[PDB]
């Protein structure tokens, strides 16, 4: 049995991003952790974590026994900084080498780790709505969905991860997936283009009422990502013949599912445009829409028109060292 206990009163200290780390009901002293890297991706690759812990006395691996299968209780938040959010999650340890009186811990989120396990036996869902499939595959997450229309058939073979079927569902429905902070998310691509922004990020403006960007990267390679999606889909249906979908002046490519709705959404994605580095905002999660204003720092203060007004967040990386808390994001536009 597992008992839910109250937090202890001996933890009087407040930190920047990483608040406390515990193994069961025992606490690793926080001053011993010198690194932290938390990554929230924009697809079903799950949140990741990496901790660098200074261990000169041989205590973390020797006496605590940290190896494959150790469950960490990590409290992450920022109740005083730019974004006052606070949450708790559980992580599953994959490996932890020890070098130079230091230990590097590689961890994966437990609810997604359970989704990244190869299947011992095959499961087939015949003529089931997508909601039942999602609930049966991942019965531990809350479902946030708005783009489920029809019913279809899905197959999960032996040795395949359950994440493959979820990604196939996303492709067939035309939505964006990411599992973070106890939820699994399906959000349509057509409705994302018409969403109002929530935050404002400005550059070269010191009288701004929003936040500030310190470094940013402009990507002009839009063909690099559109090259793979420039095809005309075709497939065989036993009662209709050959079914086409897409443009008329592109090369042909064959798939297997002869479903017009699934064929229509086969070529939808998000095109990355910009990478930026800010001063540690913990409210930045994938799916967020921001307003970006960039001024030039020489010549005559001309605005840069090559950066669109509204952008969507795709990937977020938070990083804390022993002195500073930083965030990095990748922004994109719906095709």
């Amino acid at each position: 049995t597992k008992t839910t206990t109250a937090p202890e009163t001996d933890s009087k200290r407040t930190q920047l991003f990483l608040q406390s780390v515990s193994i069961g009901q025992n606490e690793i002293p926080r001053e011993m952790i010198v690194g932290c890297t938390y990554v929230e991706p924009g697809e079903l690759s799950g949140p990741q974590l990496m901790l660098m812990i200074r261990d000169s006395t041989a205590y973390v691996v020797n006496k605590l026994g940290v190896k494959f299968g150790t469950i960490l209780t990590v409290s992450l938040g920022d109740p005083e900084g730019h974004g006052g959010i606070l949450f708790s999650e559980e992580f599953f340890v994959l490996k932890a080498p020890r070098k130079d009186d230091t230990v590097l811990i590689y961890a994966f989120s437990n609810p997604v780790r359970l989704l990244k396990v190869p299947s011992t036996s095959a499961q087939y869902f015949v003529d089931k709505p997508p909601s039942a499939v999602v609930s049966s595959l991942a019965p531990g997450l809350k479902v946030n969905a708005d783009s489920f229309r029809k019913t279809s058939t899905y197959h999960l073979n032996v040795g395949e991860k359950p994440t493959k079927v979820l990604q196939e569902i996303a492709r067939d429905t035309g939505s964006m997936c990411w599992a973070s902070r106890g939820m699994i998310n399906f959000k349509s691509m057509e409705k994302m283009a018409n969403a109002a922004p929530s935050l404002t990020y400005e550059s070269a403006n010191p009288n701004t009422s929003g936040f500030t960007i310190s470094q940013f990267n402009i990507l002009n390679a839009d063909y690099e990502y559109q090259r793979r999606h420039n095809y005309r889909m075709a497939s065989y249906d036993m009662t209709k013949g050959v079914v086409y979908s897409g443009n008329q002046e592109d090369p042909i490519k064959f798939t297997s599912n002869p479903d017009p709705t699934a064929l229509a959404n086969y070529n939808k994605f998000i095109l990355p445009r910009l990478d930026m580095l800010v001063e540690g905002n913990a409210a930045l999660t994938p799916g967020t829409t921001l307003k970006i204003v960039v001024h030039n720092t020489a010549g005559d203060g001309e605005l840069d028109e090559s950066i669109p007004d509204k952008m969507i967040v795709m990937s977020v990386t938070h990083f804390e060292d022993r002195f500073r808390f930083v965030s990095r994001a990748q922004l994109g536009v719906v095709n």
Partner: protein
């Protein structure tokens, strides 16, 4: 090309009172589409009946569309 609704003044109308929600309900239709015959129509949203039922086009085609 935008369509709007204008509520009245205090004297010649009732101003929508503060703290109220106005709902606009629109019936959307494409202008001039024709589907001939024998084509299949599949339920959506209420999709639980798709496995249960079969719906196909027959008898009169749809040809009464009109544009602006």
């Amino acid at each position: 090309e935008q369509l709007g609704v204008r509520f009245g003044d205090g004297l010649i109308g009732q101003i929508p009172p503060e703290g109220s929600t106005i709902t606009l309900k629109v019936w959307c239709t494409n202008g001039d589409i024709t589907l001939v015959a024998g084509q299949n129509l599949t339920p959506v949203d209420s999709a639980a009946n798709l496995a249960n039922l079969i719906s196909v086009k027959t008898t009169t085609p749809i040809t009464a569309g009109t544009d602006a």
